[PDB]
Amino acid sequence: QMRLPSADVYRFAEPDSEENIIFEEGIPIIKAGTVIKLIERLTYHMYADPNFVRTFLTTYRSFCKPQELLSLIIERFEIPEPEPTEADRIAIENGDQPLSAELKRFRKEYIQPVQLRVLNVCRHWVEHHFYDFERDAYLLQRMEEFIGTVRGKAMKKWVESITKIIQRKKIANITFQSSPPTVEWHISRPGHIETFDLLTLHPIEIARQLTLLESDLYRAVQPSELVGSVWTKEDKEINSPNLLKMIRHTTNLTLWFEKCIVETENLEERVAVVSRIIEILQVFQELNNFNGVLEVVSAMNSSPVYRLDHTFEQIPSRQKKILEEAHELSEDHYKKYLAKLRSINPPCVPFFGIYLTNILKTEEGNPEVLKRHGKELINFSKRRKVAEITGEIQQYQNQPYCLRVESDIKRFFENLNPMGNSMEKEFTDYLFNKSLEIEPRNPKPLPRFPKKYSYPLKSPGVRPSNPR
Amino acid sequence: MTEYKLVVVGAGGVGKSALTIQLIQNHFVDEYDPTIEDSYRKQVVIDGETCLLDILDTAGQEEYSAMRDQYMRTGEGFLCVFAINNTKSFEDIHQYREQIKRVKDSDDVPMVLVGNKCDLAARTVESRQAQDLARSYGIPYIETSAKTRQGVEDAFYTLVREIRQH
Amino acid sequence: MTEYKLVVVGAGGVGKSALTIQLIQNHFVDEYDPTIEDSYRKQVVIDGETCLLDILDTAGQEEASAMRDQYMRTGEGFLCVFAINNTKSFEDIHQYREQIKRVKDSDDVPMVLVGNKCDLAARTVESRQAQDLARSYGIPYIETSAKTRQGVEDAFYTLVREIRQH
Ligand SMILES: Nc1nc2c(ncn2[C@@H]2O[C@H](COP(=O)(O)OP(=O)(O)NP(=O)(O)O)[C@@H](O)[C@H]2O)c(=O)[nH]1
Numbered sequence: 001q002m003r004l005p006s007a008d009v010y011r012f013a014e015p016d017s018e019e020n021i022i023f024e025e026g027i028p029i030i031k032a033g034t035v036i037k038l039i040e041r042l043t044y045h046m047y048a049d050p051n052f053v054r055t056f057l058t059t060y061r062s063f064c065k066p067q068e069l070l071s072l073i074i075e076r077f078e079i080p081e082p083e084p085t086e087a088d089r090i091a092i093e094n095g096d097q098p099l100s101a102e103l104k105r106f107r108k109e110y111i112q113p114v115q116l117r118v119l120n121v122c123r124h125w126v127e128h129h130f131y132d133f134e135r136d137a138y139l140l141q142r143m144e145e146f147i148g149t150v151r152g153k154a155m156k157k158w159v160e161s162i163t164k165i166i167q168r169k170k171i172a173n174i175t176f177q178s179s180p181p182t183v184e185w186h187i188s189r190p191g192h193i194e195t196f197d198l199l200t201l202h203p204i205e206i207a208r209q210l211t212l213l214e215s216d217l218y219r220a221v222q223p224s225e226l227v228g229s230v231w232t233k234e235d236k237e238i239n240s241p242n243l244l245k246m247i248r249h250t251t252n253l254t255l256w257f258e259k260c261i262v263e264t265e266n267l268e269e270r271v272a273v274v275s276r277i278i279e280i281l282q283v284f285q286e287l288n289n290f291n292g293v294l295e296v297v298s299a300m301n302s303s304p305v306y307r308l309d310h311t312f313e314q315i316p317s318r319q320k321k322i323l324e325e326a327h328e329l330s331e332d333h334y335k336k337y338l339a340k341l342r343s344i345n346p347p348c349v350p351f352f353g354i355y356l357t358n359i360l361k362t363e364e365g366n367p368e369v370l371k372r373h374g375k376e377l378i379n380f381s382k383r384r385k386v387a388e389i390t391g392e393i394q395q396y397q398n399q400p401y402c403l404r405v406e407s408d409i410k411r412f413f414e415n416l417n418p419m420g421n422s423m424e425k426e427f428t429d430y431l432f433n434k435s436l437e438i439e440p441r442n443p444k445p446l447p448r449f450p451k452k453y454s455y456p457l458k459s460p461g462v463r464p465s466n467p468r
Numbered sequence: 469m470t471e472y473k474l475v476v477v478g479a480g481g482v483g484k485s486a487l488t489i490q491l492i493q494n495h496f497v498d499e500y501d502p503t504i505e506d507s508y509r510k511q512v513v514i515d516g517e518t519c520l521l522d523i524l525d526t527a528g529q530e531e532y533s534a535m536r537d538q539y540m541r542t543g544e545g546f547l548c549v550f551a552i553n554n555t556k557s558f559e560d561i562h563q564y565r566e567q568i569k570r571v572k573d574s575d576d577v578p579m580v581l582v583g584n585k586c587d588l589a590a591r592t593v594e595s596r597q598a599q600d601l602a603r604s605y606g607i608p609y610i611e612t613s614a615k616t617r618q619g620v621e622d623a624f625y626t627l628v629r630e631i632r633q634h
Numbered sequence: 635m636t637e638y639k640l641v642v643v644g645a646g647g648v649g650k651s652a653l654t655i656q657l658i659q660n661h662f663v664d665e666y667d668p669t670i671e672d673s674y675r676k677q678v679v680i681d682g683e684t685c686l687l688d689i690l691d692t693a694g695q696e697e698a699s700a701m702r703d704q705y706m707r708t709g710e711g712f713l714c715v716f717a718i719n720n721t722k723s724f725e726d727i728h729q730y731r732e733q734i735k736r737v738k739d740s741d742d743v744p745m746v747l748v749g750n751k752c753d754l755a756a757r758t759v760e761s762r763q764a765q766d767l768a769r770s771y772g773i774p775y776i777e778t779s780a781k782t783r784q785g786v787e788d789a790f791y792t793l794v795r796e797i798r799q800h
Pocket residue numbers: 644645646647648649650651652653663664665666667668669670692693694695750751752753754778779780781782
């Protein structure tokens with residue numbers, strides 16, 4: 001085997017024991033360890049583990065500060081070379097040149113791999129977790145000085161590379177196989193944004209533009225908004241604003257669907273509205289927008305809407321089936337949804353809520369340290385569970401949709417504001433009262449109401465057209 | 469055997485999720501995984517009758533406020549949780565109860581008020597105010613500890629009795 | 635769903651990273667940032683079945699040539715890349731195939747020969763020559779561009795079909 005430096009002058013040479021590292025039961029999986037041992041394995045000389053690097057840089061801030069991480073990898077990087085050996089001594093004493101076989105082996109098989117893996121940690125750090133440096137200018141200065149003063153031409157290529165990457169990140173185009181489908185119009189024509197509404201825009205183009213909107217919001221959520229359960233803490237507006245934008249858009253849409261329904265007082269027109277919303281749901285299923293599917297299902301299951309028996313009695317049979325299938329996605333703790341998600345061909349937009357509950361329960365359900373032999377080891381299997389979840393999230397953020405944006409329909413949906421100036425409790429009561437006005441409790445008789453929509457209520461359907 | 473569907477509701481950011489976790493988790497070790505099938509299902513014996521508990525806890529999803537009706541509608545009994553060091557969550561209890569009543573279309577739904585001690589900060593809701601609120605609603609009051617598992621069986625078992633005796 | 639461990643290998647500058655990012659993100663990277671070791675995941679439906687692709691993007695620079703045995707041991711199939719405007723990278727391909735065969739101690743390892751940068755006119759390796767090599771290994775040859783997305787899906791999905799039929 002190969003000789004390491006003294007543990008007194010290089011801390012990362014301590015032998016593994018159950019007092020500093022614990023493995024799970026073809027490289028090993030770590031269950032717990034000290035920071036030193038975690039960093040040693042993060043940059044081991046034998047094998048690379050890129051999934052371990054992603055797990056560590058995602059979750060380390062719960063057991064170690066950024067300034068201290070940088071100090072520790074700078075320390076791991078400066079490896080002391082060995083002294084000349086006996087065969088080297090004897091050669092020099094005859095004026096010959098030493099073979100230096102063990103020093104050359106130590107450089108090639110220990111120092112060089114450990115130093116590249118340290119640089120690789122730095123590369124991933126800067127390239128995928130640059131917010132540590134945005135929120136701390138001193139940390140960035142140290143990183144630049146560390147990288148900028150690495151001598152030795154074995155490292156030169158990656159040192160020049162990481163310098164350029166850090167400089168780009170500081171100041172800071174899609175290809176498809178197919179062409180995107182033609183944008184579909186119904187009663188509202190291009191540019192006539194004042195006429196835009198649920199029944200005047202084409203239901204295909206509604207689902208498409210909402211899908212693009214929600215996909216952009218989904219793809220914008222970074223793991224810094226999730227780790228530490230920070231979207232639930234007092235500072236969640238600072239720490240999780242892209243996550244909260246997404247959730248609030250989802251809530252707006254749901255309330256907009258509820259409002260469209262219960263503010264349509266005429267029963268025949270309301271059935272048209274409910275039927276159109278179910279047609280939009282169908283296109284969501286088509287486009288794999290599960291966030292949109294659950295927006296619609298949440299609206300149907302809300303209190304103001306779920307009780308409208310007279311309206312749902314008159315819904316076409318085929319659409320009760322579509323809505324009932326979509327609702328079954330959520331039964332049994334989202335059993336069928338999880339299955340469907342893990343079987344589709346992306347792009348998709350997942351439903352974020354499930355991930356949120358799983359991350360939070362994992363963080364509250366597991367101890368942050370393990371006590372072994374009077375030592376406090378960092379419980380790393382807990383951090384791997386959390387990074388497993390964030391890795392699933394990131395996987396569905398890679399694939400873009402092949403759909404044209406229509407700016408005006410996008411702007412219309414971005415600016416939707418069902419609640420207006422009212423608080424949630426007032427607005428929620430308003431919706432429920434409207435529901436009791438337009439379909440009173442039994443045995444009070446079912447009133448009649450005049451029509452509000454002047455234009456035709458016939459759905460143009462959810463099969464796409466295609467002119468030349 | 470009978471299956472009860474319980475729903476935990478209440479304000480987020482104050483340790484609500486400790487309840488279901490401490491209930492289910494092999495409460496003599498800690499390696500917890502919410503991902504796996506039936507880490508929310510639990511066979512128990514309550515008053516000699518064996519039954520199966522199905523716990524829906526959507527902690528973390530509190531900002532999806534338009535999804536509450538859908539989640540609540542699935543349940544036969546409700547655990548209404550506040551944190552004893554957070555007055556806001558205590559005052560929110562009223563709106564949660566009015567919302568439950570509305571999606572069940574009923575004025576007596578089986579529910580329990582649960583005051584949860586989630587750390588070592590100072591109590592700001594006294595037992596007395598909580599008892600009085602619980603008495604005014606006609607429901608049981610139970611206090612639990614998020615560290616020591618105290619009161620966690622009592623909270624769920626009480627709710628099952630509340631369902632059985634409806 | 636089945637998981638497949640793919641590994642992309644080849645000289646430095648041939649486009650291993652550009653291919654993988656094109657596949658994963660539909661985006662073409664113009665900068666040349668030397669890889670040490672990158673990892674990616676892709677859920678995709680191939681021939682009617684759903685599978686999870688675990689793609690490992692490797693270093694092509696000669697400085698990291700002593701760190702290959704570790705990733706060749708885990709990979710289930712290999713994407714052997716060279717650039718058609720680079721004769722030296724084509725000559726290096728022989729050496730990757732030899733090293734894989736040794737490390738995995740098999741003569742039947744799933745791989746695909748990929749000749750990248752086919753969007754360029756100035757070609758110095760001829761298709762015939764590359765194809766001759768591919769037949770002697772008993773593997774398919776596919777020309778790709780990471781810039782125009784030509785052949786990219788074809789290469790990765792072909793390799794997956796071979797791991798399936800292993
Ligand atoms: N015109 C053209 N340029 C390409 C193509 N693929 C890669 N390049 C360019 O070639 C350079 C090297 O690409 P890169 O993917 O970094 O190569 P690599 O094989 O990953 N090298 P390394 O092993 O050092 O990681 C970049 O400038 C990239 O833009 C291609 O298909 N066409």
